[PDB]
Symmetry: C3
Subunit: 105 residues, 3 copies
């Protein structure tokens, strides 16, 4: 069996057409003493990354700000900050409520 | 790593499922459809969202506003989902593959098909 | 191909304050006579289990009532009430709307 904790967040950005992006992050690991990893630590890691894009024009930070590339970047940034016994499992980024990009490791 | 684009849409249809040899009472729902297409991120894209949505909505269009018991012998959520999956697969460009189809009958009950 | 039916339900419970839990259960099996498993039957099985949690003191049942442990608790009792030809595929438990645990078999 595989266990994961999920956190959902959102941020607004433009690329120009501004959107409200909904981000879902799934971190996989083992349930140790009732916890995989506390939600607040993960959520802090995630927001610390999304805040760099919040209210910005992604065309100034990304060569080509496609939802896929933004999702990719976010995944790499998250990966670099997660704790030792945990892995980035899934990243789902919705460009508005009806369209999204799912990245699964 | 796998990369997919997801497109969400909805359509409404009325129907009654078989409860033995006889039928339940007819009623309508808003169906929520989630389609996941997997492929490689080329030039920053897997597949254009709108291109996928059009393929999917042309399909749901045949079900939209219709009595499903007139289209399916047994309009269960699984048979409808299967039918949608097959229709989509048949229309997808040669560089992607149908990965997932999630059909919700309302927001409380749904069927998930994965390839 | 794999086919699953999914049911969503909700229950409120207190532990340590109280929360509104959102549960999503996915059952994998083959489609026979047009369906994997009757939606109501699963819903019955699931809500009979959640009924034992509804507005309860979770610390009376769990030494450490974390979201993960509660998810494991539910996953197990569901596996014990399921019919012979289907399998518990996934359990997603959201404590509130933006934080959840996902168990996958
Ligand atoms: C009230 C809330 O349930 C409590 O603060 C927390 C915090 N962080 C958590 N983190 C995890 N992984 N699992 C949990 O159940 C909780 N619960
Ligand atoms: C406004 C619209 O969202 C934008 O032009 C698009 C269109 N199609 C897309 N298609 C993919 N695959 N990824 C994207 O980020 C976008 N963005
Ligand atoms: C009204 C209700 O949705 C209808 O009677 C049901 C019940 N159980 C079901 N169970 C499955 N597996 N698939 C379905 O479409 C339904 N439909």
């Amino acid at each position: 069996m595989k266990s994961r904790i999920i956190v959902r967040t959102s941020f607004d950005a433009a690329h120009v057409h501004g959107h409200t992006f909904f981000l879902e992050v799934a971190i996989e690991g083992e349930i140790k003493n009732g916890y995989v990893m506390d939600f607040l630590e993960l959520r802090k890691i995630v927001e610390e990354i999304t805040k760099e894009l919040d209210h910005r024009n992604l065309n100034n930070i990304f060569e080509n700000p496609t939802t896929e590339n933004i999702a990719l970047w976010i995944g790499e940034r998250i990966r670099d900050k997660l704790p030792p016994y945990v892995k980035l499992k899934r990243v789902v980024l919705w460009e508005g409520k009806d369209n999204g990009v799912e990245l699964e490791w």
